[PDB]
């Protein structure tokens, strides 16, 4: 079997800058980007991701060729929701490198 | 109603369960089967297979851990070849090998199946399946199922239940409806459509 | 697919999906995030649905209000033409019938009568 | 030239935009958009309503 | 809030820091173990990989100055060549190049 690996980034509003006026941390104001910098990138709602940090799962494999997914399964996730539940459901939105290397 | 949504419930369905299906394709019989009194290797064999065809089909169902069912064609154990060894052993036949053109793994080969999941059972027609037996006297043996005809494919229908299960039933119904609440039907595989719940009938 | 291993041997990938345990197919249901829900909750249960039908109005239908919003209603009765005319305008301005005394308090279920 | 893994990018308005808005928000709030009871003396100073 | 965002944080985080892996993918078994009972070179080898599959994986983790990780395999050190040094030789053996897919 294949296995997420937990990235654990920190406190997910570590680095911005602070406003008096908190409203000024929601999007649109702000917003997190996750990229490669290969051309794969999706932007997050900091305010949207159900957790204090931002945590990144990792999943690959050992196949016919490079695939390497980097998802944020508590992005849009119920507070009910399992963490299984929420790793299965990130995949559609997840960051998808397949470049063959 | 906002720009984003949240995630309530996920459930995951699969046809067969635990089980997937190994499909080889090759141009001619690869096979002996018991009882059978003349060979009919490398005999071309059409047959209906959906529509009539010409290539013949082979099948061998499996789960992730390698093993696989316990699998009866009519009254008779098909004895099949655990996946992973069939495989070394199948392409380790020079003969064999060389008259297959395809191998794909599937989750539904357009049959309803006598199956059972926990018990990995599985019972095959035997005028639609026949135990294979592929040999070449100096690697391992492979036994596996010929599919001898398929003539129609089928719809399998799976119950998910409640519609409305999942959602958090608002004091105003009508938070219920599209855009409020979608109901998403995906294969985390680049297929997805979105639902309207109220619309399913 | 799944390699051929013959003399032409040297696309996609089979094995991570497998192997990340994706097969089948998968129901995912989504809602409005809490704020909206607040946000739009709040304001049916105090001036109900848009409608637009042409229809008798529910005038006492739920438990403690109505909301009622017109447009060209057609009011009749043996009332003097002037009277009949400011009632017409009072229900195309919207209005809220109180069927309870305690006028005023959003707060309760008003379910259905 | 050093490109492996992901990366987190982390982006916010420009500072002619913060101050435009901020003071906005200072004086009159938020947009709300709830049905409910008024916010009149839950500030230490003032309170707009509207 | 204006056509344009200042970046403000960057980071960057990798699966493994700073080891990545060469995969090396062959139709049959180029190699020898110490203390194998017979040799299985050229042998037709598939294995669960994810899936069951029939080809043969080999992996060599590496750093960007051509230095590898002192590797166990089990209690035993796996004596792995540096990567550089590596690669001249597998494509010099002509047996081990020809069966590389």
Same mark, same amino acid.
Request: aromatic share 12%.
């Given at each position: 079997?294949?296995? %997420?690996?937990?990235?654990?980034?920190?406190?997910?509003?570590?680095?911005?800058?602070?406003?008096?006026?908190?409203?000024?941390?929601?999007?649109?104001?702000?917003?997190?980007?996750?990229?490669?910098?290969?051309?794969?990138?999706?932007?997050?709602?900091?305010?949207?991701?159900?957790?204090?940090?931002?945590?990144?799962?990792?999943?690959?494999?050992?196949?016919?060729?490079?695939?390497?997914?980097?998802?944020?399964?508590?992005?849009? %996730?119920?507070?009910?929701?399992?963490?299984?539940?929420?790793?299965?459901?990130?995949?559609?939105?997840?960051?998808?490198?397949?470049?063959?290397? | 109603?906002?720009?984003?949504?949240?995630?309530?419930?996920?459930?995951?369905?699969?046809?067969?369960?635990?089980?997937?299906?190994?499909?080889?394709?090759?141009?001619?019989?690869?096979?002996?089967?018991?009882?059978?009194?003349?060979?009919?290797?490398?005999?071309?064999?059409?047959?209906?297979?959906?529509?009539?065809?010409?290539?013949?089909?082979?099948?061998?169902?499996?789960?992730?851990?390698?093993?696989?069912?316990?699998?009866?064609?009519?009254?008779?154990?098909?004895?099949?070849?655990?996946?992973?060894?069939?495989?070394?052993?199948?392409?380790?036949?020079?003969?064999?090998?060389?008259?297959?053109?395809?191998?794909?793994?599937?989750?539904?080969?357009?049959?309803?199946?006598?199956?059972?999941?926990?018990?990995?059972?599985?019972?095959?027609?035997?005028?639609?399946?026949?135990?294979?037996?592929?040999?070449?006297?100096?690697?391992?043996?492979?036994?596996?199922?010929?599919?001898?005809?398929?003539?129609?494919?089928?719809?399998?229908?799976?119950?998910?239940?409640?519609?409305?299960?999942?959602?958090?039933?608002?004091?105003?119904?009508?938070?219920?409806?599209?855009?409020?609440?979608?109901?998403?039907?995906?294969?985390?595989?680049?297929?997805?459509?979105?639902?309207?719940?109220?619309?399913?009938? | 697919?799944?390699?051929?291993?013959?003399?032409?041997?040297?696309?996609?990938?089979?094995?991570?999906?497998?192997?990340?345990?994706?097969?089948?197919?998968?129901?995912?249901?989504?809602?409005?995030?809490?704020?909206?829900?607040?946000?739009?909750?709040?304001?049916?249960?105090?001036?109900?649905?848009?409608?637009?039908?042409?229809?008798?109005? &529910?005038?006492?239908?739920?438990?403690?209000? &109505?909301?009622?919003?017109?447009?060209?209603?057609?009011?009749?009765?043996?009332?003097?033409?002037?009277?009949?005319?400011?009632?017409?305008?009072?229900?195309?301005?919207?209005?809220?019938?109180?069927?309870?005394?305690?006028?005023?308090?959003?707060?309760?279920? &008003?379910?259905?009568?």
């Amino acid at each position: 079997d294949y296995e %997420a690996l937990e990235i654990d980034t920190g406190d997910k509003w570590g680095g911005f800058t602070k406003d008096q006026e908190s409203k000024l941390m929601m999007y649109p104001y702000c917003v997190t980007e996750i990229t490669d910098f290969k051309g794969n990138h999706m932007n997050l709602k900091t305010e949207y991701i159900n957790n204090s940090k931002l945590k990144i799962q990792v999943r690959g494999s050992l196949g016919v060729s490079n695939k390497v997914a980097y998802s944020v399964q508590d992005y849009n %996730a119920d507070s009910a929701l399992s963490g299984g539940n929420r790793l299965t459901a990130s995949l559609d939105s997840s960051l998808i490198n397949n470049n063959p290397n | 109603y906002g720009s984003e949504y949240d995630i309530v419930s996920v459930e995951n369905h699969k046809p067969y369960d635990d089980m997937m299906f190994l499909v080889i394709i090759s141009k001619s019989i690869m096979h002996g089967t018991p009882g059978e009194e003349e060979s009919r290797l490398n005999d071309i064999n059409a047959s209906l297979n959906g529509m009539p065809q010409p290539l013949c089909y082979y099948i061998h169902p499996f789960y992730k851990d390698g093993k696989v069912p316990k699998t009866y064609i009519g009254d008779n154990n098909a004895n099949l070849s655990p996946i992973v060894n069939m495989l070394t052993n199948i392409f380790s036949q020079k003969s064999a090998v060389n008259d297959i053109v395809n191998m794909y793994v599937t989750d539904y080969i357009g049959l309803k199946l006598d199956y059972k999941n926990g018990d990995k059972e599985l019972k095959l027609d035997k005028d639609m399946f026949e135990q294979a037996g592929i040999a070449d006297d100096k690697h391992g043996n492979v036994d596996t199922i010929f599919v001898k005809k398929i003539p129609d494919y089928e719809a399998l229908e799976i119950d998910t239940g409640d519609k409305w299960g999942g959602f958090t039933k608002d004091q105003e119904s009508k938070l219920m409806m599209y855009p409020y609440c979608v109901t998403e039907i995906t294969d985390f595989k680049g297929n997805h459509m979105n639902l309207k719940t109220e619309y399913i009938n | 697919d799944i390699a051929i291993l013959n003399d032409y041997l040297s696309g996609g990938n089979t094995a991570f999906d497998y192997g990340n345990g994706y097969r089948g197919v998968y129901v995912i249901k989504k809602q409005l995030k809490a704020e909206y829900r607040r946000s739009l909750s709040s304001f049916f249960h105090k001036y109900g649905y848009k409608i637009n039908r042409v229809k008798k109005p &529910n005038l006492r239908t739920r438990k403690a209000f &109505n909301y009622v919003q017109t447009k060209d209603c057609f009011i009749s009765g043996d009332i003097n033409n002037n009277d009949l005319q400011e009632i017409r305008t009072i229900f195309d301005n919207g209005i809220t019938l109180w069927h309870t005394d305690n006028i005023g308090n959003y707060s309760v279920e &008003n379910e259905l009568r």
